Amino acid sequence: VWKDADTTLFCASDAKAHETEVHNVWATHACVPTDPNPQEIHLENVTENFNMWKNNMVEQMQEDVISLWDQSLQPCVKLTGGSVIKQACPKISFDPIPIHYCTPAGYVILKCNDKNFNGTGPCKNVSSVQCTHGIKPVVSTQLLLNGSLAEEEIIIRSENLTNNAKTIIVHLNKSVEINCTRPSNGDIRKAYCEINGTKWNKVLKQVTEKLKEHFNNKTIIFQPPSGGDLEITMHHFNCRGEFFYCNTTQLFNNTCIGNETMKGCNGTITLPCKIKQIINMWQGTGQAMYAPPIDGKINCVSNITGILLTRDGGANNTSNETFRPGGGNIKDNWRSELYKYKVVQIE
Amino acid sequence: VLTQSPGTLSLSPGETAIISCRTSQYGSLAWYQQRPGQAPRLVIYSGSTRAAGIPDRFSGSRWGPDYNLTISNLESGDFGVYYCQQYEFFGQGTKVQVDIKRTVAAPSVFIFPPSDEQLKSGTASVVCLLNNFYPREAKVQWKVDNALQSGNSQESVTEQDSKDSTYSLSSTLTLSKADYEKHKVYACEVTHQGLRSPVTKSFNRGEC
Amino acid sequence: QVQLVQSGGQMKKPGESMRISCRASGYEFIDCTLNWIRLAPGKRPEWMGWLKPRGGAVNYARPLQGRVTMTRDVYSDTAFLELRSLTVDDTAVYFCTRGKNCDYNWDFEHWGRGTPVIVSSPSTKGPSVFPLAPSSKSTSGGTAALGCLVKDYFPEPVTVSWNSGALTSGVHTFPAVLQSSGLYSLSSVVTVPSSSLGTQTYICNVNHKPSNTKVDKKAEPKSC
Ligand SMILES: *[C@@H]1O[C@H](CO)[C@@H](O[C@@H]2O[C@H](CO)[C@@H](O[C@@H]3O[C@H](CO[C@H]4O[C@H](CO)[C@@H](O)[C@H](O)[C@@H]4O)[C@@H](O)[C@H](O[C@H]4O[C@H](CO)[C@@H](O)[C@H](O)[C@@H]4O)[C@@H]3O)[C@H](O)[C@H]2NC(C)=O)[C@H](O)[C@H]1NC(C)=O
Ligand SMILES: *[C@@H]1O[C@H](CO)[C@@H](O)[C@H](O)[C@H]1NC(C)=O
Ligand SMILES: *[C@@H]1O[C@H](CO)[C@@H](O)[C@H](O)[C@H]1NC(C)=O
Numbered sequence: 001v002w003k004d005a006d007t008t009l010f011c012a013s014d015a016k017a018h019e020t021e022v023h024n025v026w027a028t029h030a031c032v033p034t035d036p037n038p039q040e041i042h043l044e045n046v047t048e049n050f051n052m053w054k055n056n057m058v059e060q061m062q063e064d065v066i067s068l069w070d071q072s073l074q075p076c077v078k079l080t081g082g083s084v085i086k087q088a089c090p091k092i093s094f095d096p097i098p099i100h101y102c103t104p105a106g107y108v109i110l111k112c113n114d115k116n117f118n119g120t121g122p123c124k125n126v127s128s129v130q131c132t133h134g135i136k137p138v139v140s141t142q143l144l145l146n147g148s149l150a151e152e153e154i155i156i157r158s159e160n161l162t163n164n165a166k167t168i169i170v171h172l173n174k175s176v177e178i179n180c181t182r183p184s185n186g187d188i189r190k191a192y193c194e195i196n197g198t199k200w201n202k203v204l205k206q207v208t209e210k211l212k213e214h215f216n217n218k219t220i221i222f223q224p225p226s227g228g229d230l231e232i233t234m235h236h237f238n239c240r241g242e243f244f245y246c247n248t249t250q251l252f253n254n255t256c257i258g259n260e261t262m263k264g265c266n267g268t269i270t271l272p273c274k275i276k277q278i279i280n281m282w283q284g285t286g287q288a289m290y291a292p293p294i295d296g297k298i299n300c301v302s303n304i305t306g307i308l309l310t311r312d313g314g315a316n317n318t319s320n321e322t323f324r325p326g327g328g329n330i331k332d333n334w335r336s337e338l339y340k341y342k343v344v345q346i347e
Numbered sequence: 348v349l350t351q352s353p354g355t356l357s358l359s360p361g362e363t364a365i366i367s368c369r370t371s372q373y374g375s376l377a378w379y380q381q382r383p384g385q386a387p388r389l390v391i392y393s394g395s396t397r398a399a400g401i402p403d404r405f406s407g408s409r410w411g412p413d414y415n416l417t418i419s420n421l422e423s424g425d426f427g428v429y430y431c432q433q434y435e436f437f438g439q440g441t442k443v444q445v446d447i448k449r450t451v452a453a454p455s456v457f458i459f460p461p462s463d464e465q466l467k468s469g470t471a472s473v474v475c476l477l478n479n480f481y482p483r484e485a486k487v488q489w490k491v492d493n494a495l496q497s498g499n500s501q502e503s504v505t506e507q508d509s510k511d512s513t514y515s516l517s518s519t520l521t522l523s524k525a526d527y528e529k530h531k532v533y534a535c536e537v538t539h540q541g542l543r544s545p546v547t548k549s550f551n552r553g554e555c
Numbered sequence: 556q557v558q559l560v561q562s563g564g565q566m567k568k569p570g571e572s573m574r575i576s577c578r579a580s581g582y583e584f585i586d587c588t589l590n591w592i593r594l595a596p597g598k599r600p601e602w603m604g605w606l607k608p609r610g611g612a613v614n615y616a617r618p619l620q621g622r623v624t625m626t627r628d629v630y631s632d633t634a635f636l637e638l639r640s641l642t643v644d645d646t647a648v649y650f651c652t653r654g655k656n657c658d659y660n661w662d663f664e665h666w667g668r669g670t671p672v673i674v675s676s677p678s679t680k681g682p683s684v685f686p687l688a689p690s691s692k693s694t695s696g697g698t699a700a701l702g703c704l705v706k707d708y709f710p711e712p713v714t715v716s717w718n719s720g721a722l723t724s725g726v727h728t729f730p731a732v733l734q735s736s737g738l739y740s741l742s743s744v745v746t747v748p749s750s751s752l753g754t755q756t757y758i759c760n761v762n763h764k765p766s767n768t769k770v771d772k773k774a775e776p777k778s779c
């Protein structure tokens with residue numbers, strides 16, 4: 001017997017105390033070592049309701065990551081309002097480590113084991129764990145990187161598909177590798193990302209297939225973002241401490257969604273990226289200026305495990321739906337991982 | 348998707364207004380009031396949940412797709428235009444206005460053939476007048492060669508006379524000259540609360 | 556106390572582009588979605604699109620895509636709306652709205668005072684005045700009705716008097732109706748004793764100021 005409740009949780013990680021890497025330095029002081037023997041106790045004949053979108057666990061992870069970045073990233077100048085802060089601008093070691101979230105005494109985490117669970121609604125297959133899996137605090141937009149894959153099949157997640165203001169999280173059951181790099185030695189700002197277009201367009205075609213069935217048989221078509229900060233209109237992520245902005249226009253080409261049956265665009269698609277020094281802080285408000293990129297090959301290979309989308313609204317007579325690479329609320333990056341968890345109190 | 352009705356609602360301060368809005372999709376319906384000049388105001392949301400600062404006279408009901416907004420006792424400030432909403436979509440709106448009650452009056456019907464001056468220049472307009480009547484509810488119906496027609500007649504009602512408190516309706520049937528030549532008999536069937544039977548005024552093309 | 560303060564009303568011409576603002580106060584600007592609803596007399600209200608100050612995330616109504624642009628100034632708590640290549644059809648009152656709560660966006664409990672925008676065209680068109688002849692048969696006691704047909708003009712309004720204002724009793728000038736051609740049209744009838752069809756002379760005086768147009772037309776029974 002129990003009830004839905006919200007309490008202060010504690011994190012855990014395999015963080016190395018000596019490591020000079022940003023994430024390790026924070027988890028060292030903030031988190032406890034990982035439990036060697038995860039005790040996952042299945043619950044017989046139990047059916048609980050989950051609400052991926054109304055889960056306090058997300059709020060706590062946010063404040064954590066925010067805390068991490070606040071005392072990790074060191075901008076040369078940070079203009080927030082009429083104020084101006086100038087500090088040291090040393091380069092830093094940046095690579096996100098897996099973080100687990102555990103419950104105190106008196107509480108427990110209910111893990112949903114259903115294969116095609118869409119984040120909200122009843123769950124017939126519920127187990128009981130003391131900690132979550134290794135979630136990487138990877139901030140990004142449009143594309144979800146280094147996450148977990150969908151168990152059985154591609155899952156379209158949303159609090160309400162009919163509500164165009166509710167963001168959509170596409171959960172891939174097959175990860176596609178993205179190979180972003182900035183060749184050593186033109187311009188030191190420019191970089192690029194290589195994706196196996198053949199394998200990508202194949203997976204993205206299955207996404208449009210899953211997007212139907214939810215929106216009748218309407219023709220699913222993608223389009224680039226309609227506006228916003230460069231952090232939103234482009235694939236934004238932090239690699240090796242440097243801030244990358246990748247142009248994903250040709251990553252959502254409709255023509256190649258109908259496969260390269262008679263269309264020339266095989267091989268590998270390379271996305272035009274750039275390393276910016278002036279960025280808009282996602283943590284709070286304001287702009288930050290960072291030092292010029294380090295010399296040498298800057299490369300980070302990531303796993304595309306999810307896509308953030310936003311559906312256009314206005315027409316009802318139309319015979320199709322339009323989706324655009326979404327993002328902006330980092331909390332959704334944590335929802336794409338905590339969807340199958342829920343905190344309850346034993347009584 | 349949101350079909351609201353009626354389009355206009357003539358009532359007296361004291362009666363109860365009933366506005367309906369039939370939806371089809373899955374969503375939470377809301378209601379809005381707009382007094383002349385001022386900005387829209389939230390009345391009901393989530394179907395029946397009354398808003399903040401709203402009298403308990405406003406009430407909302409729902410049975411499936413169909414919705415109802417009802418004012419229990421209209422006042423000088425309850426008149427205006429109401430819109431039903433679902434997500435980003437709104438209804439055409441319902442205009443509730445004052446209707447000084449009087450005794451039932453019968454609509455005197457007239458009919459005017461298109462002018463030769465108009466035929467020479469493209470199209471032909473046929474007018475049907477309903478002068479001085481009450482109440483406002485009156486259904487004009489065009490017939491050509493004893494054949495019902497719809498979609499090509501646009502009506503227009505006057506403000507209630509501030510003397511005899513009557514109304515006047517102008518139903519204009521627009522046709523093309525080429526199509527006006529073919530048919531012979533034009534008539535407008537009028538049905539009103541003050542008429543014991545549908546009145547029919549007609550005229551035969553050409554002969555006057 | 557949440558309060559949306561909008562900029563003043565404006566007047567534009569077809570082809571130009573407008574730009575209106577909406578400053579919020581009484582709540583966190585980056586916590587709630589913002590909306591723009593245009594309201595024109597005789598049309599459904601129209602949602603133009605929402606704006607999430609968070610990262611400037613925006614979603615434009617499909618019909619308005621390619622014409623509309625929504626941005627914002629986070630620290631200045633102000634949101635902007637631009638609309639390009641205007642037409643007379645864009646004439647309306649533009650509101651910015653916010654949901655009752657940050658959870659659900661569509662329960663617009665908060666509105667601005669509104670920003671009236673009138674798009675006026677330098678192009679006009681005078682009315683065509685067609686006679687609405689009484690009839691042919693006249694009676695001593697019977698009553699007859701005649702009038703005009705002020706058709707195909709732009710823009711509003713047009714005034715119509717009878718016999719230079721010498722006839723006011725019985726005159727009914729109906730509200731102008733916007734035809735499918737983008738041109739307005741109204742009728743002005745008047746009732747008179749059918750006996751006075753052989754004594755009195757009826758002339759309709761149509762005035763369309765926007766085009767310096769004044770037209771007198773004699774309305775007499777069909778000469779047959
Ligand atoms: C939104 O608001 C509208 C308008 O008020 C509601 O629609 C009306 O609903 C009422 C019932 O609440 C209906 O009232 C009915 O009146 C009938 C009398 O008319 C008779 O004759 C006409 C013309 O020939 C026929 O069309 C009609 O069918 C009737 O034969 C009564 O006969 C009805 O009686 C009901 O109750 C008795 C028991 O007392 C039963 O024996 C009957 O079977 C029946 O259930 C009934 O009272 C009215 O017809 C509706 N108006 C419409 C739709 O035009 C909506 O209900 C409301 N919507 C919501 C969601 O609240
Ligand atoms: C739960 O119910 C299933 C049948 O639906 C039964 O097989 C199982 O033994 C039950 N579990 C217990 C012990 O409560
Ligand atoms: C998730 O499943 C529930 C029923 O369990 C359903 O109500 C909801 O619409 C689904 N969410 C989506 C849109 O995937």
Ligand SMILES: *[C@@H]1O[C@H](CO)[C@@H](O)[C@H](O)[C@H]1NC(C)=O
Nearest residue numbers: 042044045113114124125126
């Ligand atoms: C729940 O899922 C697990 C696999 O994740 C499976 O082994 C188990 O049999 C399921 N439980 C039930 C109730 O069938």
Ligand SMILES: *[C@@H]1O[C@H](CO)[C@@H](O)[C@H](O)[C@H]1NC(C)=O
Nearest residue numbers: 152153154155173174206210
């Ligand atoms: C992922 O799911 C889709 C159905 O949505 C299925 O067709 C595809 O084979 C799945 N991929 C894998 C590797 O299971």
Ligand SMILES: *[C@@H]1O[C@H](CO)[C@@H](O)[C@H](O)[C@H]1NC(C)=O
Nearest residue numbers: 177179180181183194299301
């Ligand atoms: C990424 O691309 C670079 C060339 O730009 C290549 O050398 C490297 O092998 C790629 N990484 C992976 C793991 O595919």
Ligand SMILES: *[C@@H]1O[C@H](CO)[C@@H](O)[C@H](O)[C@H]1NC(C)=O
Nearest residue numbers: 195196197198199200267268
């Ligand atoms: C992309 O993936 C497909 C999977 O079949 C593979 O055959 C192909 O070699 C890959 N393309 C490139 C150029 O890496």
Ligand SMILES: *[C@@H]1O[C@H](CO)[C@@H](O)[C@H](O)[C@H]1NC(C)=O
Nearest residue numbers: 224233234247248249250272
């Ligand atoms: C990305 O490149 C496309 C051209 O391929 C360009 O039109 C677009 O503006 C770029 N995206 C952004 C918003 O930087």
Ligand SMILES: *[C@@H]1O[C@H](CO)[C@@H](O)[C@H](O)[C@H]1NC(C)=O
Nearest residue numbers: 250253254255256263264265
């Ligand atoms: C999508 O790909 C096709 C085929 O290569 C190309 O012709 C078209 O320009 C592309 N669409 C874009 C880039 O928007």
Ligand SMILES: *[C@@H]1O[C@H](CO)[C@@H](O)[C@H](O)[C@H]1NC(C)=O
Nearest residue numbers: 138146237238239300301302
């Ligand atoms: C994803 O993980 C790999 C190693 O696991 C790392 O190299 C890459 O930078 C990660 N992507 C990001 C930007 O989080």
Ligand SMILES: *[C@@H]1O[C@H](CO)[C@@H](O)[C@H](O)[C@H]1NC(C)=O
Nearest residue numbers: 149174175177301302303304
């Ligand atoms: C990402 O994970 C997938 C399995 O989910 C694996 O196939 C791939 O090698 C990984 N990419 C790397 C090496 O970062």
Ligand SMILES: *[C@@H]1O[C@H](CO)[C@@H](O)[C@H](O)[C@H]1NC(C)=O
Nearest residue numbers: 120121159160163373374375
């Ligand atoms: C979606 O919206 C409806 C109301 O329109 C609400 O009843 C429902 O709970 C919402 N879906 C979920 C699961 O949040």
Ligand SMILES: OC[C@H]1O[C@@H](O)[C@H](O)[C@@H](O)[C@@H]1O
Nearest residue numbers: 228229230231278279280287
């Ligand atoms: O408005 C100025 C800002 O625009 C954003 O899109 C860019 O990411 C910032 O670098 C820039 O400071």
